[PDB]
Amino acid sequence: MKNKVQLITYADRLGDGTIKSMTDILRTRFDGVYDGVHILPFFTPFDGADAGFDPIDHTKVDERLGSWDDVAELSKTHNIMVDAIVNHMSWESKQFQDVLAKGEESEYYPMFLTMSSVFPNGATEEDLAGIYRPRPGLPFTHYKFAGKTRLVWVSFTPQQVDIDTDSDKGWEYLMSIFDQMAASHVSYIRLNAVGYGAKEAGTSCFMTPKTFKLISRLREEGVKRGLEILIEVHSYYKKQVEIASKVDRVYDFALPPLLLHALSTGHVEPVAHWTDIRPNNAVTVLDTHDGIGVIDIGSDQLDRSLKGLVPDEDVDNLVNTIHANTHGESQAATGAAASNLDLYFVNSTYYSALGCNDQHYIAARAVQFFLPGVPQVYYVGALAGKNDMELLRKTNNGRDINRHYYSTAEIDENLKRPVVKALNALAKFRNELDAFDGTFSYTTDDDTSISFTWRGETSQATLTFEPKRGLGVDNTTPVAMLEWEDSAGDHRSDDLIANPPVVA
Template identity: 35%
Template sequence: MAVKNQVQLITYPDSLGGNLKTLNNVLLKYFSDIFKGGVHILPPFPSSGDRGFAPLTYLEIEPEFGTWEDIKAIGENFDVLVDLMVNHISQKSKYFQDFLLKGRKSEYADLFITLDKLWKDGKPVKEDIDKMFLRRQVPYSAFTIKETGEEEKVWTTFGKTDPSEQIDLDVKSEKVKQLLTDFFINFSKNNVKIVRLDAVGYVIKKLGTSCFFVEPEIYEFLDFIKGLADSLGIELLPEVHSHYTIQYKLAEHGFFIYDFILPYRVLDTLINKNSQELCKYLKNRPSKQFTMLDCHDGIPVKPDMDDLIDTKEARKLVDIALERGSNLSLIVSDEHKAPDGFDVHQIRCTYYSVLNKDDDAYLAARAIQFFTPGIPQVYYVGLLAGENDIEAVERTGEGREINRHNFTLEEIEQSIKKPVVQRLLELIRFRNEYPAFNGEFKVLDCAKDEVSLSWEKEDKKCTLFIDLKTNKSVINYIDNNGKETEYLV
């Protein structure tokens, strides 16, 4: 199964109309020729937190969203992509609940990493933990086993609560390999074509290392998963937020990677009216990537942009984003902050709002994304040129809610009529249908306040030109009659 080189949608199961059935109706009614690349449905599984990212199982769909039949129905017309949190599973899952009841006697005990799997006596050693890339104060949680009253400490990389809601899986265990196999077989049965491996960088726990992207063991695990996916005709997309060189290692191993550098680069280009860094980047990046500008988190800054940005310049860009209503997520551990204290992990906003709701600037951003080699993904809020949802942030206290507005059918109907959305849909159609995007890409020489990119295949050629002084974008292309045609984006 080859991933289609066309535009994909990213959406929650309930954010375009309330559930999966309505999502399918909305896709067929408004976007049947728009998302030819497929639909990334953010976790539709029963979950105990983190808006779906703490799944109890991958064998069921959260009843509020619908059923596997609904996923299957969407898959009739659109390639479906779903997430697999390959590093962990919910504390509320039947597997961990059984372990909480029976401890080591549970048939599922081996799914989890009790501390004696790392330290012989089960006692954590501070020097080992100091070397690790931590996502919470300590990488384990203590639980009391109901039947015996004994305390068990198990590995938990993530989680805001103590004990954590997200329990790590032991990927060395045959039981975990069987469980992952069951999940993949179920995906395949239900028309899932692509699986995003969420948090895959954390799956290997090895003393003396950072426990993040541990080589070569990570590749052994990825080879196992790839063999499984290949046998079922499923494509994989590993998700790793890290220094770009780690991403590039995955690309060297033949995997698709996420372009987490592009969103910041495009924002910087449009705000500072300077394309030099963007053009330099576009000349040297791997092409087997999924591109995005916005998603359910934020615009990546650290660690994705480490060694690629000057933190003084980044601070200025962040300040402009804050003036335009954004909020920030910050780096937790001191050793991962910049020497000057710069600690921005992600800028949280809608991409339309951070570009000051300037239609031309927003279309220029999308044009750059669509001309960048890779599979373009458009987040549902970006699709509808949604604005920062400040009220949702205040109501929930969760900064990420700024870009997670749930649209009613009426709001979708109204948003689609906006000129900026109509222009975006036209641009997506061009990206989906023009044959040169399967050809050769070039970054053309241009002044620093311009962007000029081209694609060419046989007798078809298209060139994007953006004047950053005005944010106006023009595409010149050879049409089906061999005539040069100008398209004002």
């Protein structure tokens, strides 16, 4: 995966509302800034309950958005990342509809998992109780095959039926997705919900050996088509290091909340700790299309005794710090959970989570770009967007607070702001300076300061980070100094907004 900054965006929420318009905005307004892009699900349909992650036909672009040729067109300039939903598919798909009509006579009957598929011999209470769950209840719902009532395995919603990833039809389906991705010259594949993709009795059915056997089989099938794979997994941070050592690339879900903590308090030990242990085969982010994950830093869900990178109280304070900085907007968006250790995510834009503080925000991006891994910037964050209460009150969907529809007018208006111009100049710096293709090193004091250093062939750069120097939502004190060496010798920048860095 190229070591340049990528953009995460919906096709219809960045420009006129299509892949062509998205590609236009990308090329015209962000040349040299984002040379790659993760296009969020654009299949048939894209405007369902789960905003593209519940497609009926994974193989077909939503004709309202464009076509696969638009993807191929965009590939001539930008590396493209796309989601591959491997765990499940729509019950409205023709494959599953056929199983309902024809039952065991159906061509696709082996393609879908049932309780019998995994538990031919009966299941105990411990068998079903130990299954890892992202959603409440048991992962089963009622469907009638021909006329016989059956318990179909469903990890998320009853409308998304899990497929047998070891069956021929299920695998044939996954390869139809891969073949279309490779046909349109997609570079990277984000394997959605792959952690649940393998079921075996007696296990949690989440990241078991059979799961790593599936990821490796999908890897080899991908390279055979020129496709690199990436796994998305939210879990306890020690499981994250375990997983990252067995796969090609993972997400760094710990950093976003860790930077919210450090910018809220000033304590940099948790960040220095994470820097030392984190997997470096990662994709770094601050915001995503979902809420801010706090589970990731992050007591274990099943066994509270395993403590995260900060005490449970600092996790509670982090959730409440977001509620305060947004003045209750994220409360309206986040459904209460009685306690904050029971929260998965907090719904708010990352800019608003910082109280819209420019100095704090640019610093967070700077740290993101200076840690090993390929950085991504979510489109709302690329525009330093605030929470969208109107869409939230229209759709009643919590995550829409961080999914604003940006017309080309709104993009060019927000492009006039200095914080936006600083981020663009920062990504260009991150892409243009060849120091980042070299070797990484870091130093720390104790709690006040931490310095991130990259030294390459023709260039060097160091980022020092002192959140102590400026505390408060309304504090304008720069908390990140930058020094770097290039063709024009040694240079410095003590303010990354007013004095954004440039390369020779």
